[PDB]
Amino acid sequence: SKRYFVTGTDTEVGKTVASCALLQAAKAAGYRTAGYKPVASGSEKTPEGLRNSDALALQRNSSLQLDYATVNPYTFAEPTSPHIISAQEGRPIESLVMSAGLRALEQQADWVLVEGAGGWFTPLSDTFTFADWVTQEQLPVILVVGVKLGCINHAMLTAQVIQHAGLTLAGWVANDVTPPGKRHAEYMTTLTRMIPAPLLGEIPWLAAATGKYINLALL
Amino acid sequence: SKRYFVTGTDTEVGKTVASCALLQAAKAAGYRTAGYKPVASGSEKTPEGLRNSDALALQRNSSLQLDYATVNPYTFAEPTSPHIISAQEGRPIESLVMSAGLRALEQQADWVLVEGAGGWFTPLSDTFTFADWVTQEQLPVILVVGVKLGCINHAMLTAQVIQHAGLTLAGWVANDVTPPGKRHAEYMTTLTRMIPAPLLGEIPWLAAATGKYINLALL
Ligand SMILES: C[C@H](N)[C@@H](CCCCCC(=O)O)NC(=O)O
Ligand SMILES: C[C@H](N)[C@@H](CCCCCC(=O)O)NC(=O)O
């Protein structure tokens, strides 16, 4: 299976918007697809248990019909860092369960997209971050950049840290998080020049069918 | 002179609030102090030229009376990345002028605080970032962290990149950018454990006399 990890420059950069656009393009290219969000915090109660909305978006954008717990093994109600609510609830986030879940998807999908929680360095326990699991699984990384003031600095910090860990930065996606503003073209040029990986596409500001904005031929 | 560079985890983390608190504490400890903001964008017109409000805060919190242009050599009206408006206006941001200005302050002050524009990797030209000048001047760095969701990731990215450049992370300051919330203590504990430098103090949420929240004995 092709496998990719999607991370964002900041919270609220629209990372799941770009993940669904990636999933839609892969399905159009003929892949049997699966989204995976091993850890999620900020979930709703339903008759069947807690359901996180980003995870639900990945489930309905996968081309395989998949059960919710296959898409998202660890679901926490409170929208805070996973290591805080894991400790609070007495439910350890185990690396082996996170890896077993990815293997289970690879039985049935040949293009798997893995979305983390938060940014690169989100703690999962007091001695373990999301970055440690991604390095361990040796996943190529796709960076989602919300285009706004301050994103050049965040895109550059994240890009140097992934490369320092010896991982491949497979590409980046620009997500227009605000209406058109004055320095949009100059920001897109600086980001293109400075991020050492291909721009896969730009999703316009929309307050669903977004696969067309992604060029999967560059991945 | 002692010299420090202040950088923030994101835009609007209240970096100049922490710079003025640092300047107030140094003055209380008996230093002849000077703030320096070599580059600023987002300035007002006055009868004497453009004036940037952060720069004005540094000027009035310095214990020496200083002229505005000594505090802030490069002033741009538009609030965007310095390399965009520098190119637009046809006024190159020169490293030698930025360094000459720091030396000029060192003639008269023995404790100089240097504040950048934006975050670590703010471009000053197409081939030169703020990070390049700070590495060149070999300044110790103080990190200002706004405590909010998403700051663990940003504080960790910035801390690893400064250390990778071989610079000293002298310490960090926690700035409470929102009213008290649910996971404030747990966030302060995770940030203390993960940032490899002493916590110098925490400034409470206030929508001016803040020197008391800084322990200068740890610098
Ligand atoms: C306008 C902002 N306040 C700041 C410049 C921000 C540059 C951000 C660059 C980026 O996107 O990383 N200017 C200044 O502090 O003087
Ligand atoms: C609640 C957020 N949306 C996210 C967790 C953010 C963790 C941020 C940690 C930090 O401060 O760096 N959860 C999630 O995506 O499932």
Short mmCIF file of C-alpha atoms and ligand atoms in Angstrom, two decimals:
data_model
loop_
_atom_site.label_atom_id
_atom_site.label_comp_id
_atom_site.label_asym_id
_atom_site.label_seq_id
_atom_site.Cartn_x
_atom_site.Cartn_y
_atom_site.Cartn_z
CA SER A 1 0.00 0.00 0.00
CA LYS A 2 1.11 3.63 -0.50
CA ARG A 3 0.87 5.26 2.98
CA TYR A 4 1.10 8.93 3.88
CA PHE A 5 0.96 10.89 7.14
CA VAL A 6 -0.77 14.30 7.03
CA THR A 7 0.28 16.99 9.52
CA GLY A 8 -0.64 20.78 9.62
CA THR A 9 1.32 23.95 10.47
CA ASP A 10 -1.10 25.01 13.22
CA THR A 11 -4.48 23.94 14.70
CA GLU A 12 -7.42 25.15 12.49
CA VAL A 13 -5.46 25.12 9.25
CA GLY A 14 -8.17 22.84 7.71
CA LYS A 15 -6.03 19.60 7.71
CA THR A 16 -9.07 17.30 7.37
CA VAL A 17 -10.30 19.38 4.38
CA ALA A 18 -6.98 18.61 2.65
CA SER A 19 -7.13 14.91 3.81
CA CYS A 20 -10.62 14.49 2.22
CA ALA A 21 -9.42 16.21 -0.99
CA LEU A 22 -6.45 13.75 -1.03
CA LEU A 23 -8.73 10.79 -0.44
CA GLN A 24 -11.11 11.93 -3.23
CA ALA A 25 -8.27 12.31 -5.73
CA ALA A 26 -6.84 8.84 -4.87
CA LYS A 27 -10.24 7.25 -5.35
CA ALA A 28 -10.54 9.00 -8.72
CA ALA A 29 -7.14 7.55 -9.68
CA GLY A 30 -8.55 4.04 -8.94
CA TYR A 31 -7.08 3.23 -5.48
CA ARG A 32 -9.02 1.28 -2.79
CA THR A 33 -8.64 3.93 -0.08
CA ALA A 34 -8.76 4.20 3.68
CA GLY A 35 -8.37 7.10 6.07
CA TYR A 36 -6.92 6.41 9.50
CA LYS A 37 -6.96 8.76 12.51
CA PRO A 38 -5.44 6.65 15.29
CA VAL A 39 -6.03 9.29 18.03
CA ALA A 40 -8.76 11.93 18.26
CA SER A 41 -9.85 14.30 21.12
CA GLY A 42 -12.96 16.46 20.91
CA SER A 43 -15.74 13.97 20.33
CA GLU A 44 -19.57 13.73 20.50
CA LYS A 45 -21.68 11.17 22.35
CA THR A 46 -24.03 9.04 20.18
CA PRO A 47 -25.92 5.73 20.97
CA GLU A 48 -22.87 3.79 19.85
CA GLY A 49 -20.14 5.67 21.74
CA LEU A 50 -17.99 8.77 21.12
CA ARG A 51 -17.60 9.92 17.58
CA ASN A 52 -15.11 12.55 16.46
CA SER A 53 -16.19 14.60 13.37
CA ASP A 54 -12.80 14.57 11.56
CA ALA A 55 -12.67 10.79 11.92
CA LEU A 56 -16.25 10.59 10.50
CA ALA A 57 -15.09 12.68 7.52
CA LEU A 58 -12.25 10.21 6.84
CA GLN A 59 -14.63 7.22 7.17
CA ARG A 60 -17.09 8.68 4.63
CA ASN A 61 -14.37 9.74 2.25
CA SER A 62 -12.69 6.26 2.14
CA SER A 63 -13.73 4.10 -0.89
CA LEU A 64 -13.92 0.94 1.31
CA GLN A 65 -16.95 0.76 3.70
CA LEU A 66 -15.11 0.73 7.08
CA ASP A 67 -16.29 0.51 10.73
CA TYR A 68 -15.69 3.53 12.85
CA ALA A 69 -13.31 1.89 15.37
CA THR A 70 -11.14 0.68 12.46
CA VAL A 71 -10.74 4.35 11.37
CA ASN A 72 -10.33 5.66 14.87
CA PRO A 73 -9.24 3.31 17.68
CA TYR A 74 -8.75 6.00 20.37
CA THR A 75 -11.61 8.52 20.83
CA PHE A 76 -11.59 11.09 23.66
CA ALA A 77 -14.43 13.50 24.45
CA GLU A 78 -12.48 16.50 25.66
CA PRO A 79 -10.74 18.69 22.98
CA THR A 80 -7.28 18.93 24.69
CA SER A 81 -3.86 17.30 24.16
CA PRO A 82 -4.23 13.46 24.02
CA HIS A 83 -1.66 12.82 26.79
CA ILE A 84 -3.73 14.90 29.32
CA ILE A 85 -7.07 13.21 28.67
CA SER A 86 -5.44 9.74 28.27
CA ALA A 87 -3.94 10.14 31.80
CA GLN A 88 -7.21 11.54 33.10
CA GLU A 89 -9.28 8.69 31.85
CA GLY A 90 -6.81 5.91 32.65
CA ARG A 91 -6.59 4.71 29.01
CA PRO A 92 -2.93 4.57 27.79
CA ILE A 93 -2.32 5.30 24.13
CA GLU A 94 -0.31 2.32 22.98
CA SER A 95 2.03 2.42 19.98
CA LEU A 96 1.40 -1.28 19.23
CA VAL A 97 -2.40 -0.68 18.94
CA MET A 98 -1.79 2.36 16.71
CA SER A 99 0.53 0.21 14.46
CA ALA A 100 -1.79 -2.84 14.51
CA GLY A 101 -4.61 -0.64 13.27
CA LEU A 102 -2.55 0.62 10.32
CA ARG A 103 -1.66 -3.01 9.34
CA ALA A 104 -5.34 -3.99 9.50
CA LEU A 105 -6.20 -1.27 6.99
CA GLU A 106 -3.30 -2.35 4.73
CA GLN A 107 -5.04 -5.76 4.44
CA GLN A 108 -7.80 -4.13 2.50
CA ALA A 109 -6.66 -0.80 1.17
CA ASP A 110 -3.79 -0.02 -1.15
CA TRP A 111 -3.71 3.74 -0.48
CA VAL A 112 -3.87 4.68 3.21
CA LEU A 113 -3.89 8.24 4.54
CA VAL A 114 -2.98 8.66 8.24
CA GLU A 115 -4.00 11.88 10.01
CA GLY A 116 -2.51 12.82 13.37
CA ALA A 117 -4.04 14.90 16.18
CA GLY A 118 -2.76 18.53 16.56
CA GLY A 119 0.66 19.39 15.09
CA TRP A 120 3.96 17.44 14.76
CA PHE A 121 4.97 17.26 18.34
CA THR A 122 1.63 16.32 19.98
CA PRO A 123 2.39 14.28 23.19
CA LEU A 124 0.65 10.90 23.46
CA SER A 125 2.18 10.10 26.84
CA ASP A 126 4.78 11.76 29.06
CA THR A 127 7.58 9.98 27.25
CA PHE A 128 6.11 9.51 23.74
CA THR A 129 4.99 11.99 21.03
CA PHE A 130 3.19 11.53 17.72
CA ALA A 131 6.48 12.34 16.00
CA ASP A 132 8.08 9.24 17.66
CA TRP A 133 5.40 6.87 16.22
CA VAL A 134 5.57 8.44 12.70
CA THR A 135 9.42 8.15 12.70
CA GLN A 136 9.12 4.58 13.84
CA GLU A 137 6.63 3.69 11.10
CA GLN A 138 8.82 5.55 8.58
CA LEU A 139 5.81 7.25 6.99
CA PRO A 140 6.29 9.95 4.23
CA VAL A 141 4.75 13.20 5.40
CA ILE A 142 2.42 15.65 3.58
CA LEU A 143 2.34 19.10 5.18
CA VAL A 144 -0.95 21.17 5.11
CA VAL A 145 -0.25 24.93 5.23
CA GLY A 146 -3.13 27.36 5.99
CA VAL A 147 -2.15 30.49 4.06
CA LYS A 148 -2.19 33.39 6.56
CA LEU A 149 0.27 35.76 8.28
CA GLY A 150 2.66 33.66 10.29
CA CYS A 151 2.52 30.49 8.14
CA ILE A 152 5.98 30.93 6.53
CA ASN A 153 7.63 30.59 9.90
CA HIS A 154 5.44 27.59 10.89
CA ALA A 155 5.89 25.81 7.55
CA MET A 156 9.67 26.23 7.70
CA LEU A 157 9.96 25.01 11.36
CA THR A 158 7.89 21.89 10.65
CA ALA A 159 9.74 21.13 7.37
CA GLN A 160 13.22 21.29 9.00
CA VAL A 161 12.17 19.17 11.94
CA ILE A 162 10.73 16.33 9.73
CA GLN A 163 13.88 16.29 7.57
CA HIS A 164 16.08 16.31 10.67
CA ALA A 165 14.23 13.15 11.76
CA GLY A 166 15.28 11.58 8.37
CA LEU A 167 11.73 11.32 7.05
CA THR A 168 10.62 12.17 3.53
CA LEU A 169 8.54 15.29 3.12
CA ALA A 170 6.42 14.05 0.26
CA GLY A 171 4.73 17.38 -0.52
CA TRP A 172 2.58 20.19 0.78
CA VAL A 173 -0.97 21.43 0.28
CA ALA A 174 -2.01 25.13 0.55
CA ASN A 175 -5.40 25.59 2.24
CA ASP A 176 -6.98 29.03 1.85
CA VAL A 177 -8.37 29.62 5.28
CA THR A 178 -9.55 33.23 4.66
CA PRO A 179 -11.11 35.10 1.67
CA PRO A 180 -8.63 36.55 -0.92
CA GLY A 181 -6.34 39.14 0.65
CA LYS A 182 -3.63 41.53 -0.50
CA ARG A 183 -0.48 39.43 -0.34
CA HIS A 184 -1.81 36.04 -1.43
CA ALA A 185 0.40 35.59 -4.49
CA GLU A 186 3.56 36.75 -2.75
CA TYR A 187 2.87 34.35 0.18
CA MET A 188 2.32 31.40 -2.25
CA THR A 189 5.64 32.26 -4.04
CA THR A 190 7.70 32.49 -0.76
CA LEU A 191 6.12 29.17 0.48
CA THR A 192 6.81 27.44 -2.82
CA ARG A 193 10.45 28.58 -2.85
CA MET A 194 11.11 27.68 0.83
CA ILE A 195 9.37 24.32 1.44
CA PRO A 196 11.64 21.60 0.06
CA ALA A 197 8.85 19.40 -1.41
CA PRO A 198 6.33 19.71 -4.30
CA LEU A 199 3.12 21.81 -3.90
CA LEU A 200 0.37 19.19 -4.53
CA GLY A 201 -2.44 21.77 -4.96
CA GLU A 202 -4.33 24.69 -3.42
CA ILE A 203 -7.87 24.38 -1.98
CA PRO A 204 -9.84 27.68 -2.27
CA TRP A 205 -11.70 29.38 0.58
CA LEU A 206 -15.07 27.79 0.93
CA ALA A 207 -17.11 28.46 4.13
CA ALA A 208 -17.11 19.20 -0.45
CA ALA A 209 -15.92 17.97 -3.90
CA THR A 210 -12.35 19.05 -3.68
CA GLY A 211 -10.35 16.16 -5.24
CA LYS A 212 -9.85 18.26 -8.41
CA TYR A 213 -7.57 20.72 -6.59
CA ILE A 214 -5.04 17.96 -5.91
CA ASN A 215 -2.45 16.74 -8.43
CA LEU A 216 -1.79 13.17 -7.25
CA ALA A 217 0.77 12.74 -10.02
CA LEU A 218 3.29 14.64 -7.87
CA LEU A 219 3.14 12.20 -4.94
CA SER B 1 26.62 44.32 27.60
CA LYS B 2 24.31 41.34 28.23
CA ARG B 3 22.28 40.92 24.98
CA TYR B 4 19.22 38.76 24.38
CA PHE B 5 17.00 38.06 21.37
CA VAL B 6 13.27 37.58 22.05
CA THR B 7 11.21 35.42 19.66
CA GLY B 8 7.58 34.08 20.04
CA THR B 9 5.88 30.77 19.17
CA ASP B 10 3.25 32.41 16.95
CA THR B 11 2.07 35.93 15.95
CA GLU B 12 -0.17 37.48 18.70
CA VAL B 13 1.45 35.60 21.57
CA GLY B 14 2.11 38.98 23.32
CA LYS B 15 5.94 39.02 22.69
CA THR B 16 6.25 42.78 23.32
CA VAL B 17 4.35 42.38 26.64
CA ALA B 18 7.06 39.92 27.74
CA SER B 19 9.84 42.21 26.30
CA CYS B 20 8.56 45.19 28.39
CA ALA B 21 8.31 42.96 31.50
CA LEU B 22 11.95 41.87 30.85
CA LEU B 23 13.07 45.46 30.38
CA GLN B 24 11.28 46.55 33.61
CA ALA B 25 12.92 43.78 35.63
CA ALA B 26 16.41 44.60 34.26
CA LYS B 27 15.96 48.26 35.14
CA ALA B 28 14.90 47.24 38.66
CA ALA B 29 18.09 45.16 38.92
CA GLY B 30 20.11 48.35 38.13
CA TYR B 31 21.02 47.88 34.41
CA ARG B 32 21.14 50.81 31.91
CA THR B 33 18.72 49.25 29.41
CA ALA B 34 17.82 49.53 25.76
CA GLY B 35 15.25 47.79 23.60
CA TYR B 36 16.05 47.27 19.93
CA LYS B 37 13.61 46.25 17.19
CA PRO B 38 15.72 46.42 14.03
CA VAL B 39 12.78 45.67 11.65
CA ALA B 40 9.08 46.47 12.10
CA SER B 41 6.08 46.30 9.67
CA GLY B 42 2.64 47.63 10.57
CA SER B 43 3.29 51.26 11.37
CA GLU B 44 1.39 54.58 11.80
CA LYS B 45 2.06 57.91 10.10
CA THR B 46 2.90 60.85 12.43
CA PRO B 47 4.47 64.32 11.67
CA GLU B 48 7.90 62.79 12.11
CA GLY B 49 7.53 59.66 9.98
CA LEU B 50 6.23 56.10 10.51
CA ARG B 51 6.06 54.82 14.02
CA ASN B 52 5.42 51.20 14.95
CA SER B 53 3.65 50.68 18.34
CA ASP B 54 5.80 47.74 19.57
CA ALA B 55 8.93 49.78 18.87
CA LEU B 56 7.39 52.72 20.82
CA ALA B 57 6.77 50.34 23.75
CA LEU B 58 10.46 49.32 23.74
CA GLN B 59 11.58 52.98 23.54
CA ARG B 60 9.46 53.97 26.56
CA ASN B 61 10.44 50.93 28.55
CA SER B 62 14.24 51.48 28.10
CA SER B 63 15.95 53.28 31.05
CA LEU B 64 18.10 55.40 28.64
CA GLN B 65 16.22 58.20 26.77
CA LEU B 66 16.70 56.99 23.15
CA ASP B 67 15.65 58.40 19.73
CA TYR B 68 13.14 56.40 17.82
CA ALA B 69 15.37 55.58 14.81
CA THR B 70 18.02 54.21 17.21
CA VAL B 71 15.38 51.73 18.53
CA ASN B 72 13.96 50.97 15.14
CA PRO B 73 16.03 51.62 12.00
CA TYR B 74 13.64 49.95 9.51
CA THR B 75 9.93 50.94 9.74
CA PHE B 76 7.37 49.74 7.18
CA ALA B 77 3.72 50.81 7.06
CA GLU B 78 2.10 47.63 5.82
CA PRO B 79 1.67 44.73 8.36
CA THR B 80 3.07 41.90 6.15
CA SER B 81 6.35 39.94 5.98
CA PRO B 82 9.34 42.37 5.84
CA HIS B 83 10.81 40.86 2.64
CA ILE B 84 7.57 41.62 0.67
CA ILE B 85 7.26 45.26 1.70
CA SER B 86 11.06 45.82 1.54
CA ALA B 87 10.98 44.66 -2.14
CA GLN B 88 7.84 46.69 -2.77
CA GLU B 89 9.27 49.88 -1.45
CA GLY B 90 12.78 49.47 -2.89
CA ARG B 91 14.48 49.64 0.56
CA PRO B 92 16.78 46.59 1.16
CA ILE B 93 17.09 45.36 4.72
CA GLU B 94 20.83 45.27 5.27
CA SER B 95 22.49 43.02 7.84
CA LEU B 96 25.32 45.54 8.36
CA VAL B 97 22.82 48.32 9.31
CA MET B 98 21.01 45.92 11.67
CA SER B 99 24.40 45.01 13.32
CA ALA B 100 25.65 48.64 13.38
CA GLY B 101 22.51 49.63 15.25
CA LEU B 102 23.06 46.97 17.93
CA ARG B 103 26.70 48.18 18.42
CA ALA B 104 25.48 51.78 18.78
CA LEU B 105 23.18 50.74 21.63
CA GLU B 106 26.00 48.76 23.28
CA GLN B 107 27.93 52.08 23.56
CA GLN B 108 25.40 53.28 26.04
CA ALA B 109 23.48 50.36 27.46
CA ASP B 110 24.78 47.36 29.34
CA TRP B 111 21.61 45.25 29.00
CA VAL B 112 20.14 45.18 25.48
CA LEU B 113 16.98 43.32 24.48
CA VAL B 114 16.53 42.66 20.73
CA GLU B 115 13.03 41.86 19.44
CA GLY B 116 12.52 40.40 15.98
CA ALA B 117 9.52 40.74 13.64
CA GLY B 118 7.16 37.68 13.37
CA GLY B 119 8.54 34.25 14.34
CA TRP B 120 11.99 32.59 13.96
CA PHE B 121 12.11 32.17 10.27
CA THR B 122 10.81 35.59 9.11
CA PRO B 123 12.38 36.38 5.65
CA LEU B 124 14.19 39.72 5.38
CA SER B 125 15.13 39.21 1.74
CA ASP B 126 14.81 36.32 -0.72
CA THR B 127 18.09 34.85 0.45
CA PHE B 128 18.24 36.02 4.10
CA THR B 129 16.03 35.33 7.16
CA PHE B 130 15.97 36.79 10.67
CA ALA B 131 17.36 33.47 11.90
CA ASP B 132 20.52 34.02 9.73
CA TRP B 133 21.26 37.43 11.38
CA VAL B 134 20.62 36.11 14.94
CA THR B 135 22.95 33.10 14.30
CA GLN B 136 25.54 35.44 12.91
CA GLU B 137 25.37 37.75 15.94
CA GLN B 138 25.43 34.69 18.22
CA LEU B 139 22.66 36.08 20.42
CA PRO B 140 21.14 33.94 23.28
CA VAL B 141 17.42 33.49 22.67
CA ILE B 142 14.44 33.90 25.05
CA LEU B 143 11.29 32.18 23.78
CA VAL B 144 7.82 33.73 24.56
CA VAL B 145 5.07 31.06 24.66
CA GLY B 146 1.38 32.15 24.58
CA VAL B 147 -0.36 29.43 26.60
CA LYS B 148 -3.17 28.05 24.40
CA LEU B 149 -4.08 24.85 22.52
CA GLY B 150 -1.38 24.22 19.97
CA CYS B 151 1.52 25.92 21.83
CA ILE B 152 3.28 22.68 22.89
CA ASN B 153 3.91 21.81 19.28
CA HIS B 154 5.04 25.37 18.40
CA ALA B 155 7.29 25.71 21.47
CA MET B 156 8.97 22.36 20.74
CA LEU B 157 9.54 23.12 16.99
CA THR B 158 11.11 26.52 17.75
CA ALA B 159 13.27 25.12 20.61
CA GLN B 160 14.75 22.31 18.46
CA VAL B 161 15.46 24.61 15.56
CA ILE B 162 17.38 27.19 17.72
CA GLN B 163 19.47 24.42 19.33
CA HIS B 164 20.15 22.87 15.92
CA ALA B 165 21.57 26.25 14.88
CA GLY B 166 23.98 25.98 17.90
CA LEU B 167 22.49 28.93 19.76
CA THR B 168 21.75 29.07 23.47
CA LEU B 169 18.12 29.01 24.48
CA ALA B 170 18.46 31.20 27.53
CA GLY B 171 14.93 30.67 28.85
CA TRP B 172 11.24 30.99 28.17
CA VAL B 173 8.37 33.18 29.34
CA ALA B 174 4.71 31.99 29.56
CA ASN B 175 2.22 34.69 28.49
CA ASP B 176 -1.41 34.04 29.43
CA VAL B 177 -3.20 35.14 26.33
CA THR B 178 -6.72 34.05 27.44
CA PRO B 179 -8.62 34.03 30.80
CA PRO B 180 -8.06 30.95 33.07
CA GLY B 181 -9.21 27.75 31.37
CA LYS B 182 -9.53 24.09 32.28
CA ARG B 183 -6.12 22.67 31.43
CA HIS B 184 -3.86 25.57 32.42
CA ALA B 185 -1.81 23.73 35.03
CA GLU B 186 -1.33 20.63 32.91
CA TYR B 187 -0.20 22.79 29.94
CA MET B 188 2.34 24.68 32.16
CA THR B 189 3.71 21.30 33.45
CA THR B 190 4.10 19.76 29.92
CA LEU B 191 5.79 23.03 28.66
CA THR B 192 8.13 23.14 31.65
CA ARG B 193 9.16 19.50 31.18
CA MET B 194 9.66 19.78 27.38
CA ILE B 195 11.39 23.13 26.77
CA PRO B 196 15.09 22.67 27.53
CA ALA B 197 15.63 26.07 29.23
CA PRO B 198 14.48 27.72 32.51
CA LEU B 199 10.95 29.23 32.81
CA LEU B 200 11.72 32.91 33.65
CA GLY B 201 8.14 33.75 34.75
CA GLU B 202 4.46 33.81 33.80
CA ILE B 203 2.57 37.03 32.93
CA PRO B 204 -1.18 36.79 33.82
CA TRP B 205 -4.05 37.62 31.47
CA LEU B 206 -4.62 41.32 31.53
CA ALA B 207 -6.79 42.90 28.78
CA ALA B 208 1.59 47.68 32.47
CA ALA B 209 3.80 47.09 35.57
CA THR B 210 4.81 43.55 34.87
CA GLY B 211 8.53 43.39 35.83
CA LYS B 212 7.58 41.52 39.04
CA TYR B 213 6.49 38.43 37.10
CA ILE B 214 10.03 37.94 35.78
CA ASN B 215 12.85 36.27 37.73
CA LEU B 216 15.96 37.82 36.16
CA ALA B 217 18.14 35.71 38.43
CA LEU B 218 17.59 32.76 36.07
CA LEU B 219 19.05 34.49 33.01
C1 LIG C 1 3.07 42.30 10.94
C2 LIG C 1 3.60 41.44 12.08
N1 LIG C 1 3.37 42.08 13.35
C3 LIG C 1 5.10 41.30 11.99
C4 LIG C 1 5.52 40.54 10.75
C5 LIG C 1 5.04 39.10 10.67
C6 LIG C 1 5.83 38.34 9.60
C7 LIG C 1 5.30 36.92 9.50
C8 LIG C 1 6.00 36.10 8.41
C9 LIG C 1 5.42 34.69 8.33
O1 LIG C 1 4.37 34.44 7.69
O2 LIG C 1 6.07 33.84 8.93
N2 LIG C 1 5.68 42.64 11.97
C10 LIG C 1 6.32 43.17 13.03
O3 LIG C 1 6.32 42.57 14.09
O4 LIG C 1 6.89 44.25 12.95
C1 LIG C 2 -8.39 19.12 20.01
C2 LIG C 2 -7.57 19.26 18.74
N1 LIG C 2 -8.44 19.20 17.57
C3 LIG C 2 -6.63 18.09 18.56
C4 LIG C 2 -5.57 18.06 19.65
C5 LIG C 2 -4.63 19.26 19.68
C6 LIG C 2 -3.41 18.93 20.54
C7 LIG C 2 -2.51 20.16 20.60
C8 LIG C 2 -1.28 19.94 21.49
C9 LIG C 2 -0.41 21.20 21.54
O1 LIG C 2 -0.67 22.15 22.32
O2 LIG C 2 0.55 21.19 20.77
N2 LIG C 2 -7.42 16.86 18.61
C10 LIG C 2 -7.69 16.13 17.51
O3 LIG C 2 -7.36 16.55 16.41
O4 LIG C 2 -8.26 15.05 17.58
#
